[PDB]
Amino acid sequence: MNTVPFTSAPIEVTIGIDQYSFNVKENQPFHGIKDIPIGHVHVIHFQHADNSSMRYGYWFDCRMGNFYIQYDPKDGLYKMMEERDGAKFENIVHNFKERQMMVSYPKIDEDDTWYNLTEFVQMDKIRKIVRKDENQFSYVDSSMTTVQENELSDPAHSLNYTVINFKSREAIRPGHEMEDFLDKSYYLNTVMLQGIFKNSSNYFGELQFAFLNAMFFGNYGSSLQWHAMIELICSSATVPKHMLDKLDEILYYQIKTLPEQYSDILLNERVWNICLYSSFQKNSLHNTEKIMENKYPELL
């Protein structure tokens, strides 16, 4: 069970750890988060009490190193940093725990929500979408644009999601125009699965990461990517059976976790209506269709 200690909390802030969150008051004696489950990627995120922008966070995996948060008063944010000195870190964490200055990652034993949302998400794939190779953790925020968004400006601070464009030469074989446009199986199975992702696990990893960035940061480009990757499977007549059964599980837990009050901005009417009611896979997503119908029947 790993720990992300904090130097201090000099500014009032809502702190998120995965699907949990808690309010810290300006100069509250808060020294971090303990009992973080090993074996999964985690996100720690921030929203300053004084700012309706400034919404940002760090993807990390405690197996890759010792990570702490320290407020930077020049750049005005909580920064993740790696501590390379193992014994200094262990001694800092031990003091803070003895003085009970750390909140406990509040996981219910019965509860597989976080595993279900991150089943295919790997830190090494996150680091290729985010790109800051001097750090073992990845910064994301509300405003970061995707490579696709920038094609339609600063490349260093972009989300490098796989570009998906249904009206592109990549998506459409010469002489198979109607076939490839109405049935995206070629584009899904040959171009994207066999060609770019190599396997369904990498494809699902990027889909899950896109969803989490959309939900935790309200990142518009991540939301567009999540919907595109769903629509590309739903618009394919030929999908491996295991991929369809797994997609149904992935989307079920994403819809289950979505805050009710964000379903108006985070869910695209056209995509969901197409996927559940018109597409080739309209009868393949039983769990996802039942939760969407019971939770968001207006959207549809």
């Binding site: 009206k167 592109s168 030469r169 459409i172 125009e177 109607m178 446009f181």
Partner: protein, 237 residues
């Protein structure tokens, strides 16, 4: 964006453009079968591809053989239209290729855009205009060449005959849309107006009669009366 009343003069500038109308590509008669069910029988169709500046019509005849053993024909018809339009552009020398293609129906946008991915500089545009190009099959010589076709065939016409010798494209296009709106609203009356005077003939190489400028004014007047008289014949207004 969309071609409308606001941006009408753009049709007669010096940027090569084509209108594409797919309304006569897939044509059927609906009939009863022996068992009292309903069936369709396809007849020959055509793509109507028109340069509004020059009058140059590229009439691609769609032979019923194209449909043999195919499903979802109303959907295939749009993709077939897009394939033929893309093949026509590819067949033209670069300096004759259109800069824009305007589709008379919005359902043609995606099929044409996907067939023309190789031509990123050619803009594919819808129109807000309600163009009467469906009545092309009311022009006897165009109807005749479509119905007699025994195979796929491209036939090349000037839909303005020799009018551009005396009038501008703007006026020629206005005269064409008036004639086609009339034919579309009341084909019998419209044809009566065009052929009533036996002294005025159609040249062998023309589609329309050889009217003097004064005779065109009279004809155009009779066409506008027919259109309003039919609009008061239908609407009780």
């Amino acid at each position: 964006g969309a071609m409308n009343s606001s941006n009408y003069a753009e049709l007669f500038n010096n940027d090569i453009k084509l209108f594409v109308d797919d309304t006569n590509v897939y044509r059927v008669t609906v009939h009863k079968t022996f068992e009292g069910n309903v069936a369709t029988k396809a007849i020959n169709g055509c793509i109507f591809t028109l340069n509004p500046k020059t009058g140059h019509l590229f009439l691609k005849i769609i032979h019923t053989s194209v449909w043999a053993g195919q499903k979802r024909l109303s959907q295939l018809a749009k993709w077939k239209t897009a394939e033929e339009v893309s093949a026509l552009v590819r067949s033209l020398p670069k300096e004759e290729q259109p800069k824009q293609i305007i589709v008379t129906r919005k359902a043609m946008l995606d099929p044409l855009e996907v067939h023309m991915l190789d031509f990123p500089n050619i803009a594919i545009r819808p129109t807000e205009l309600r163009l009467p190009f469906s009545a092309a099959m009311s022009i006897d010589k165009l109807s005749d060449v479509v119905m007699k076709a025994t195979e796929p065939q491209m036939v090349l016409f000037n839909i303005y005959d020799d009018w551009l010798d005396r009038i501008s494209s703007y006026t020629a296009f206005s005269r064409l849309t008036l004639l086609l709106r009339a034919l579309k609203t009341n084909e019998e009356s419209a044809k009566m107006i065009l052929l009533s005077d036996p002294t005025i003939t159609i040249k062998s190489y023309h589609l329309w009669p050889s009217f003097t400028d004064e005779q065109w004014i009279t004809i155009e007047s009779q066409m506008r009366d027919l259109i309003l008289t039919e609009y008061g014949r239908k609407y009780n207004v």
